[PDB]
């Protein structure tokens, strides 16, 4: 509960690791630190703290009254949840629904947010067994702008009794986490491993399909369970959002989960066309 996880600098497009071995304890933690080169975080950080409360006629008010955006008015498990078996009330909201929904100065931090994690993902591959021709298929066509981007905001409501939120592991590539706040444990070596925040800096990790692309290369890459603990209602209110990068679930553009095999390059291992005509038959029999 003491180890610290490994940090990186985005420098030219590369990690630049505070030790030599921190890239290789990144893909085995599945969790990293990573400097925020500066970003203006404010738009983001108010919404977090507003987006759950009434909307009046303030200045706060282009970034309250959230509960309006509900899956009707998106997509569904799109917008504004208030679920209670975690105390998390939660905004989440893909990218093509941005400029229709957030404020301009959230809008801006969001796009720049989804770069920037695009540029960590390029960067990771930059070190790993994964030849540079193959990246953008391998990855689900998310780093030429087809994935699937979402934009997600944590409410921890202190005066709700339950898990913060669940363990879970995240579907995708990276996820960015902006947070300030301890609560995030991570799975490391059988134990639960707090991780707090540290200033200036965001929290990396890797989802599924990182690990199916790359656990039968030279360097497979850990998608990590991880949780939020309970938040006491000694004042507590805790706020996170991330930015989750996903491959584009559209199998005309992307026909679903690759690995990469050295020497034989990409094997198409989950085919989401297939699947979906699979479903369909079923649905259509199962009535
Ligand atoms: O709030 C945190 O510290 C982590 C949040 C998280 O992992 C998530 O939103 O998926
Ligand atoms: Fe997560």
């Known amino acids: ?120 993902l390029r960067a990771v591959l930059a070190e790993l067994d994964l030849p540079v021709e193959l990246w953008d298929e391998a ?43 301890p609560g995030l444990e991570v799975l490391r070596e059988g134990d639960w491993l707090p991780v707090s925040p540290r200033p200036g800096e965001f929290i990396v990790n890797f989802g599924c399909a990182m690990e199916i692309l790359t656990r039968h290369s030279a360097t497979p890459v850990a998608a990590v369970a991880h949780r939020v603990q309970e938040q006491l209602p000694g004042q507590a209110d805790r706020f996170s959002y991330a930015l989750f990068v996903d491959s584009s679930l559209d199998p005309r553009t992307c026909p679903g989960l690759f690995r990469y095999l050295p020497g034989h390059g990409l094997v198409l291992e989950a085919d989401f066309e297939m699947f979906l005509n699979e479903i369909l038959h079923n649905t259509y029999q199962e009535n």
């Open 1 to 120: 509960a003491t180890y610290a996880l490994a940090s990186a600098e985005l420098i030219d497009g590369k990690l630049r690791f505070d030790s030599s071995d921190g890239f290789a304890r990144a893909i085995a933690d599945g969790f990293f630190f990573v400097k925020s080169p500066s970003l203006d975080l404010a738009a983001g950080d108010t919404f977090a703290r507003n987006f759950y409360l009434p909307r009046q006629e303030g200045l706060g008010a282009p970034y309250q009254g959230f509960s309006q955006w509900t899956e009707d008015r998106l997509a569904r498990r799109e917008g504004y949840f208030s679920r209670d078996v975690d105390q998390v009330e939660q905004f989440f909201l893909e990218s093509r629904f941005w400029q229709t929904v957030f404020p301009g100065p959230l809008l801006r931090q969001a796009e720049r947010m989804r770069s920037f994690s695009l540029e960590v």
């Open 139 to 181: 990855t689900g066509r998310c780093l030429s702008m087809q994935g699937t981007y979402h934009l997600t905001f944590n409410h921890f409501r202190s005066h709700v009794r339950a898990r913060g939120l669940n363990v879970h592991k995240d579907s995708g590539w990276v996820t960015i986490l902006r947070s300030l706040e």
